[PDB]
Amino acid sequence: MVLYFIGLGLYDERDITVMGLEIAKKCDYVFAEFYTSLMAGTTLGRIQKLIGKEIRVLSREDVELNFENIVLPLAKENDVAFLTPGDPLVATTHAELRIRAKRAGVESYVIHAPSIYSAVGITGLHIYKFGKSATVAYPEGNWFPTSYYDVIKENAERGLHTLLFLDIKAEKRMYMTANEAMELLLKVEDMKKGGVFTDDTLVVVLARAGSLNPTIRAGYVKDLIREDFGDPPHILIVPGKLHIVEAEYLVEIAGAPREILRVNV
Amino acid sequence: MVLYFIGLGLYDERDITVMGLEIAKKCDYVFAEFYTSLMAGTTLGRIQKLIGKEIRVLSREDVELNFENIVLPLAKENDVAFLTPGDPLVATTHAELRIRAKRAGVESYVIHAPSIYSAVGITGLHIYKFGKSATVAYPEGNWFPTSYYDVIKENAERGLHTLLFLDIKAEKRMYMTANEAMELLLKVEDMKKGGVFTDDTLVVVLARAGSLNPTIRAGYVKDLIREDFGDPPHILIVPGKLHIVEAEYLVEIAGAPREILRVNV
Numbered sequence: 394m395v396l397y398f399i400g401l402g403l404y405d406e407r408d409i410t411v412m413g414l415e416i417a418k419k420c421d422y423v424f425a426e427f428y429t430s431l432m433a434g435t436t437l438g439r440i441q442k443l444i445g446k447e448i449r450v451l452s453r454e455d456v457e458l459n460f461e462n463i464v465l466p467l468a469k470e471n472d473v474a475f476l477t478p479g480d481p482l483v484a485t486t487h488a489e490l491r492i493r494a495k496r497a498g499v500e501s502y503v504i505h506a507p508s509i510y511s512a513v514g515i516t517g518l519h520i521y522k523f524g525k526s527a528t529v530a531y532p533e534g535n536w537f538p539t540s541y542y543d544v545i546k547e548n549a550e551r552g553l554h555t556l557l558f559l560d561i562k563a564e565k566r567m568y569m570t571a572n573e574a575m576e577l578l579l580k581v582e583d584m585k586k587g588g589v590f591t592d593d594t595l596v597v598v599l600a601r602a603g604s605l606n607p608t609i610r611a612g613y614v615k616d617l618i619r620e621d622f623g624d625p626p627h628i629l630i631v632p633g634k635l636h637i638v639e640a641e642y643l644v645e646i647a648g649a650p651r652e653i654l655r656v657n658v
Numbered sequence: 659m660v661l662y663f664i665g666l667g668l669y670d671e672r673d674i675t676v677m678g679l680e681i682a683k684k685c686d687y688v689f690a691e692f693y694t695s696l697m698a699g700t701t702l703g704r705i706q707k708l709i710g711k712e713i714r715v716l717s718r719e720d721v722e723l724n725f726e727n728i729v730l731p732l733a734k735e736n737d738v739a740f741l742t743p744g745d746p747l748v749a750t751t752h753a754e755l756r757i758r759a760k761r762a763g764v765e766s767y768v769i770h771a772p773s774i775y776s777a778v779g780i781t782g783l784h785i786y787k788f789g790k791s792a793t794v795a796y797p798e799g800n801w802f803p804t805s806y807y808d809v810i811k812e813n814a815e816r817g818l819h820t821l822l823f824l825d826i827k828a829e830k831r832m833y834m835t836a837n838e839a840m841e842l843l844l845k846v847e848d849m850k851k852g853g854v855f856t857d858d859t860l861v862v863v864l865a866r867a868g869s870l871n872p873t874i875r876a877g878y879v880k881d882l883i884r885e886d887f888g889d890p891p892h893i894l895i896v897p898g899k900l901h902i903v904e905a906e907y908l909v910e911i912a913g914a915p916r917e918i919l920r921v922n923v
């Protein structure tokens with residue numbers, strides 16, 4: 394009679410919360426999507442094995458067009474679950490699915506999980522200092538998205554950090570890397586020239602958060618653009634003016650150039 | 659030789675991730691702190707029972723002044739776990755502890771869990787639209803802090819949502835309610851008079867995030883400043899201009915007045 398939105402976490406199946414595991418385990422039907430993000434440490438099997446249920450994986454289409462046709466009806470007479478990577482409501486449109494559940498007479502519940510949005514705290518950057526967020530999207534045809542560039546600008550003026558979610562094309566199995574993102578940013582700089590993103594801008598890269606050996610790096614674009622951060626998923630962060638402790642961490646932990654320690658108050 | 663920072667999640671003892679509960683059980687020693695926050699939906703006893711390890715609670719002084727004399731020494735020759743509410747390293751000072759671990763030649767790994775920063779997505783407000791964050795502190799003595807007001811000013815000005823943490827006297831186990839926070843904001847408005855927070859201002863209140871039955875309420879200050887949002891802690895959110903999808907979710911899910919569909923979009 395109820396629908397459960399359950400996050401699976403950052404990297405592998407275990408990143409699910411105890412609450413989530415016990416709820417899934419006792420659900421009649423189990424659905425899930427793997428297009429809003431990439432969990433690089435698991436497979437559908439492990440998930441099924443860990444949960445003890447078969448999972449019917451839905452596509453973006455199935456969801457954005459037929460959620461209320463494929464999943465809701467079932468919830469009407471059973472306890473159904475819908476699994477997603479990270480937290481199910483962060484940087485997605487799944488929140489709107491809840492309204493569909495309401496309009497279908499189905500009560501829904503959200504079981505949170507660790508999200509990349511807060512996991513970036515491992516970069517040593519103060520979470521409260523992050524400003525507006527944005528996504529570096531793959532250009533399509535002659536359409537070249539640029540707004541994410543303005544966000545960085547607007548935040549930096551206020552001294553706020555910018556969190557840049559990198560694009561993903563699950564079906565095409567395309568996962569944007571920090572490098573490609575840095576590449577697109579540089580090209581946007583040329584056609585705007587706002588002195589916002591250049592070879593001397595400081596950036597921070599976080600790859601595969603949730604894994605025990607994630608890639609945490611900070612430095613100048615020039616020195617990082619061609620660097621290997623390992624397999625996806627990747628996220629890019631353009632920090633604002635740093636606090637001494639943030640810099641001390643970036644250097645001591647992310648291998649940033651000791652010269653960022655000498656902050657220009 | 660290994661120090662494990664494990665997040666306990668948001669509300670009860672079931673909010674810890676499966677990876678966290680396993681790494682915790684296999685540790686030799688287990689520390690925890692409940693000064694940055696409390697798990698209002700559980701107890702130290704229930705967490706101890708779930709992990710099967712006695713837990714030593716450290717104070718804000720035990721950590722900020724003697725982390726290296728209390729926890730790291732044991733981490734040199736054993737597997738030690740440091741448990742904290744929410745997601746590790748989100749609390750602005752916990753990051754430098756990893757630096758202390760590095761300095762002591764100790765290995766450290768961060769085991770994530772749900773944070774209030776990502777969990778607030780249950781309000782239906784888009785995550786990327788959150789700006790700088792802040793804490794509403796109680797005035798006291800001759801000290802009357804008001805920055806959180808300006809934070810709201812700069813975010814709403816750029817159409818960004820402001821996440822407001824409410825003061826907590828962790829030790830005395832005393833919380834600031836959402837109602838109290840509003841009353842304080844009105845007084846700040848009444849003094850600075852910047853057209854930021856008034857009776858007509860729209861706010862969102864989140865309580866007990868992480869439990870299956872969170873309180874999600876949205877509406878105008880004048881109709882919510884005296885409303886009963888249940889037990890603490892409470893999170894207050896002052897939204898910026900809303901996306902129609904956001905407003906609809908606040909109406910359909912958080913019981914907000916239809917008036918917001920024409921006044922706040």
Ligand SMILES: Nc1ncnc2c1ncn2[C@@H]1O[C@H](CSCC[C@H](N)C(=O)O)[C@@H](O)[C@H]1O
Nearest residue numbers: 430479480483508509559601602626627628
């Ligand atoms: N474990 C991880 N490590 C690094 N980046 C990650 C990540 N998980 C997600 N991301 C980033 O966020 C994008 C997916 S956005 C969807 C996020 C999800 N709801 C959550 O709560 O995490 C990815 O393309 C990537 O840029």
